[PDB]
Symmetry: C2
Subunit: 91 residues, 2 copies
């Protein structure tokens, strides 16, 4: 129940790194606003519950410790990675 | 009041998820991936409420929302993750 502060902070910082890696190669003024939205959302997070959805989206990046712009893998293979993470839980 | 929704929505979303899962894992023919396919099929069959397949919705959000199949969409991982970020933002606003 009581999640550890350090784990929350490492996860939050890794999520910020991955978000910056994603929205680095992007220069539209609406995508700037979306990147700022998600970055502020990550910065304001205080519990694992706040980060839950971002962890869900970036699971196979946090695991394997990859960055999306440098990870040469197809979209289908990424969804299969996520299905494997799905199967790992509930065990 | 939030009761009659759940059966119909879980049924429709299930159908879409079977379509997507068949697209991904039914074509190939390795042993342990047959096992994983069977696993996910039984998992979908046993799902009863929205919270049971919340995780599958999370994984395949952009696929269901835009009627796309993973083997045919042909977009990068980064663009798919941006699509998921957009679904994310839409959830709160």
């Amino acid at each position: 129940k009581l999640d550890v502060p350090s784990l929350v902070e490492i996860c939050k910082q890794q999520l910020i790194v991955i978000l910056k890696d994603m929205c680095a190669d992007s220069n539209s003024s609406d995508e700037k606003a979306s990147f700022m939205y998600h970055l502020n959302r990550l910065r304001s997070a205080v519990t694992v519950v706040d980060l839950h959805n971002y962890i869900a989206v970036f699971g196979p990046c946090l695991s394997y410790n990859k960055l999306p712009s440098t990870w040469n893998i197809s979209v289908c293979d990424y969804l299969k990675q996520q299905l494997n993470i799905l199967r790992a839980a509930d065990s």
